[PDB]
A paper describes a structure:
Remarkably, PBP4, the only class C PBP encoded in the S. aureus genome, which purportedly functions as both a carboxypeptidase and transpeptidase PBP, has a short, cytosolic C-terminal mini-domain with the sequence of N-R-L-F-R-K-R-K, satisfying the consensus GpsB-binding motif (S/T/N)-R-X-X-R-(R/K) found in S. aureus FtsZ and in orthologous PBPs found to bind to GpsB. To do so, we generated an R24A mutant because of its central role in the head-to-head interaction and its distance from the PBP-binding groove. This point mutation successfully disrupted the occluded crystal packing interface and allowed us to determine a 2.40 Å resolution structure of Sa PBP4 peptide bound to Sa GpsB. Unambiguous electron density for the Sa PBP4 C-terminal octapeptide, which adopted an α-helix, was resolved at the PBP-binding groove of GpsB. This structure clearly shows that two of these residues, Arg425 and Arg428, are key components of the Sa PBP4-Sa GpsB interaction, where they form multiple hydrogen bonds with the main chain amides of Sa GpsB Ile13, Tyr14, Lys16, and the sidechain hydroxyl of Tyr26. Furthermore, Arg425 and Arg428 form two salt bridges with the carboxyl sidechain of Asp32. Additionally, Sa GpsB Asp36 appears to play a major role in stabilizing the PBP4 α-helix by forming two hydrogen bonds with the backbone nitrogen of Arg425 and Leu426, an arrangement that is only possible when these two residues are part of an α-helix. Overall, the complex of Sa PBP4/Sa GpsB is very similar to Bs PBP1/Bs GpsB and is distinguished by the interactions of two Arg residues with the backbone and acidic sidechains lining the PBP-binding groove. A crystal structure of the Sa PBP4 C-terminal recognition sequence bound to the N-terminal domain of GpsB reveals a binding mode that mimics previously solved orthologous PBP/GpsB pairs. This discovery is notable because it was previously thought that only the N-terminal ‘mini-domain’ of transpeptidase PBPs (class A, class B) could bind to GpsB.
Residue numbers in the entry:
A (entry chain C): 424 to 430
B (entry chain A): 6 to 70
C (entry chain B): 3 to 69
The structure:
Amino acid sequence: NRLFRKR
Amino acid sequence: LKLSAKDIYEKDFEKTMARGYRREEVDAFLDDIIADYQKMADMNNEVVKLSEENHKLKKELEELR
Amino acid sequence: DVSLKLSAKDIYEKDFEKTMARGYRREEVDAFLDDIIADYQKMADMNNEVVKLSEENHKLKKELEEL
C-alpha cells in the first residue's frame, strides 16, 4: 500500500 | 501482463514543483490498481472454479427436472 | 470479490488534481498508467467471464433452492 509509504 | 502488483508498489516517479499531480491522489488510485492486479493473478483459477461449480449446479438441476 | 473494480476506461478517464508543492511529473504517471491500461485490456475478456459465471451460479443456486 503506497499511500502510507512515507511519513 | 507487462506489470505485477509488486512492480506498481515498487514504482517511483520524479517529483516536481511544476504542476505535478497530487502524490496522495496518484498513490490512492494505484493502490486500487494493486488490489485489481492481485485479483488478475488469481482470475484464471477463479474462472476454472466457477465453471466447475457452473457445471455441478447444471447437472443437479437437470437431474431434478 | 474476484472481479476488477476498475476498467481500462476508468484509468484512461481518471484526471489527477495538480499541486505547486512536491508532486509527480505528469509525463511519468501518464506513461505508467498506459502500460497499466494495456494489462486491463488483456484481462477484460476473462474479467467479463468471471462476472457472468458469478451471476449465472447465483441464479442457478436460487433455482435449486426452490426445488
